[PDB]
């Protein structure tokens, strides 16, 4: 109904305004922290190095910024456009995740990126639906074995369907939300909260880019970097299936 | 179809590897240059400041990089707010749309925690509204097309081709309104190039949301109504991008 959709517009609008109020309340008081830190680093350096004027340090910092802004990395193997990192970057596109922790610097890069995505995303969506159906099949089939137990326990077939859905997501959650977060905690030296934040930002395809796992491989742990890709693939499909059915439940309501 | 799933997987895999090759070819050289420039900047600073060890300068740079990475601005030493009501509103929008530009990061654990639940609840809610607007927007377009379609049928063009021509007009005008119109708008408003603007538009409507480009984010602009109003476009554009792709899928099936 057109009347109802106008209502829905207004609701969402309120969900946004309410969100805005909360983020502002939680984040505005720390808007300036990074400047402060930068200034502290400057002031500290000046005090140690009397041969340096504040102004000269300033120019150094600008020049450093320009280089970092072109993709340079502070050095003390780190190429974001070597084959593996470019592979990853392409992934971030067709998944629509779009971390963007590494920006394209060339107009050709941008141009190509347009067509790469237009063709890549739907192509990926297809594979994702495919893996979603196949993964759900495997899950629902395994859960079917546990369902056998509930039906013998004379639990109503309607609730058994519900228990299995709860199980369906709960086990996925365990495998694709919980398991990875614990993995990343140890691997990335993130906090539990940072890791879940990452995971969920990732699987929702929000892809902020403030946290990113698998862009580069780790020596002394080869299986890491692929498993992450494998994970994203499987996790996105699990997440998709949940959204389609929760989308499914919602639209009829 | 298990056979097809494996074929599809292999295809995508090749789409990625092919993408990787191209991005590396287009971007690595610029990156390798920036890395060189960073090192030139260091070497130049050492030659001018004998009180400074390379290793000490390295630490300074790492520290500067971290701060810039956290959104510090090289140019000033310290009015405008990234978390004012309008920008926070916008930020919330970037979540539920799953676009996730991320040009301003959350710094607080509360911010992150809240962001998780905000999205889990926000995205499906939005998906619903989007489907709604997609159907309603397509309806309104289809109704408007009908009157001009009357003219084609009288001109004795077959009903099968008139349907095709109308689709062309259907998308061409949508494209005009939601792709072309905005890109021309942003070109003038953001001082981007045409190519940058289309890049932005498309990165946006695909929900990739890299965050290298973000409309309204510019600090200098005195443009309060601008940034949410752009969201008005985002809403309309996303749904159209969606609804059309949905109906295309149905026609294919």
């Amino acid at each position, epitope marked *: 109904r057109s009347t109802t959709l106008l209502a829905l517009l207004a609701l969402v609008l309120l969900y946004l305004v309410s969100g805005a109020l909360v983020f502002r309340a939680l984040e505005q008081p720390h808007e300036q922290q990074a400047q402060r830190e930068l*200034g*502290e680093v400057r*002031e500290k350096f*000046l*005090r140690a190095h*009397p*041969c*340096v*004027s*504040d*102004q*000269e340090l*300033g120019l150094l910092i600008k020049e450093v910024a320009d280089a970092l802004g072109g993709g340079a990395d502070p050095e003390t193997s780190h190429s974001a456009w070597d084959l593996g990192s470019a592979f990853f970057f392409s992934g971030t596109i067709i998944t629509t995740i779009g971390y963007g922790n590494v920006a394209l610097r060339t107009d050709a890069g941008r141009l190509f990126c347009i067509f790469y995505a237009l063709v890549g995303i739907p192509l990926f969506g297809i594979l994702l639906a495919g893996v979603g159906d196949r993964l759900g099949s495997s899950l629902r089939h395994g859960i079917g074995h546990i369902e056998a137990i509930f039906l013998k326990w004379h639990v109503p077939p309607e609730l058994v369907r519900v228990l299995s859905a709860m199980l369906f997501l709960l086990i996925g959650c365990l495998l694709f939300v919980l398991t990875p977060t614990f993995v990343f905690c140890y691997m990335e030296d993130w906090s539990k909260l940072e890791a879940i934040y990452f995971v969920i930002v990732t699987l929702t395809t929000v892809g902020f880019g403030d946290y990113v796992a698998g862009a580069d491989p780790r020596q002394d742990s080869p299986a890491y970097q692929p498993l992450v890709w494998f994970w994203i693939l499987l996790g996105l499909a699990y997440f998709a299936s949940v959204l389609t059915t929760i989308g499914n439940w919602l639209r009829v309501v | 179809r298990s056979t097809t799933l494996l074929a599809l997987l292999a295809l995508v895999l090749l789409y990625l590897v092919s993408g990787a090759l191209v991005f590396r070819a287009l971007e690595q050289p610029h990156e390798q240059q920036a890395q060189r420039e960073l090192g030139e900047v260091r070497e130049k600073f050492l030659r*001018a*400041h*004998p*009180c400074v060890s390379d290793q000490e300068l390295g630490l300074l740079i790492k520290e500067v990089a971290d701060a810039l990475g956290g959104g510090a601005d090289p140019e000033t*030493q*310290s009015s405008h707010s990234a978390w004012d009501l309008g920008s926070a509103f916008f930020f919330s929008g970037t979540i539920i749309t799953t676009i996730g530009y991320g040009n301003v990061a959350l710094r607080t654990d509360a911010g992150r925690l809240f962001c998780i639940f905000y999205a889990l609840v926000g995205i499906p809610l939005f998906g619903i509204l989007l489907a709604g607007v997609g159907d309603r927007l397509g309806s309104s377009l289809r109704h408007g097309i009908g009157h001009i379609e009357a003219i084609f049928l009288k001109w004795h063009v077959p009903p099968e081709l008139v349907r095709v021509l109308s689709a062309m007009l259907f998308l061409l005008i949508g494209c005009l309104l939601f792709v072309l119109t905005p890109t021309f708008v942003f070109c003038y408003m953001e001082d981007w190039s045409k190519l940058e603007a289309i890049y932005f538009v498309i990165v946006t409507l695909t929900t990739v949301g890299f965050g290298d480009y973000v409309a309204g984010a510019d600090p200098r602009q005195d443009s309060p109504a601008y940034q949410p109003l752009v969201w008005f476009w985002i809403l309309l554009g996303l749904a159209y991008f969606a609804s059309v792709l949905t109906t295309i899928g149905n026609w294919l099936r």
Partner: antibody
Amino acid sequence: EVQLQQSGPELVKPGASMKTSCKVSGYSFTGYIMNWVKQRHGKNLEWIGLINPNTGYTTYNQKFKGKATLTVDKSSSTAYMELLSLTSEDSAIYYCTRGNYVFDYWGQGTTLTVSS
Amino acid sequence: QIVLTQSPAIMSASPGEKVTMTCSASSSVSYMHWYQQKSGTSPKRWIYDTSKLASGVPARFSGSGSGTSYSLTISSMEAEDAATYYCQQWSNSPPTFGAGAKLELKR
């Protein structure tokens, strides 16, 4: 005993320019930033600008951008300020002082008198 | 650009009296420095980085403050303390000075 020895008082006609000096001893000239400061009779101190004796780099107060030119002679560890197009408002005491965050040593000052 | 206000511009103290002069900044700085000047002669770094004493300085002097408000204090005035004290900042280029506070002996 660090010491910044400024040259003597100078008297010049309006319009002329004038160059004044500050010879440092007791430390290494090129290791520290040199500044100059203006004090018009018994009033606020005004930073004119700085030079880095080692690199030649200079920056100036906007107020003094056109007015003052800082230079150094490394061999004689001496710093120079030139003032240009002098007007009556330039009559003051001028100091060389050392520092990149606080001004830890000052010359004894030199008095400039601009008058017809 | 950053403006430093010292007020009042004049004050007076008997010997033994405690003396406090303040420096308020148009916007925040991380550190404040102070100079002592006696007529006839150049300023002397007196206190730097807010609360560090320069070499010569006797203990009766102290400094404190943060953000936008800083102070210089004499626990117990002495005769040789009569002078003009200036604050200055360099957390933002260009460095700037207060307009000074003149401290005379009471009688």
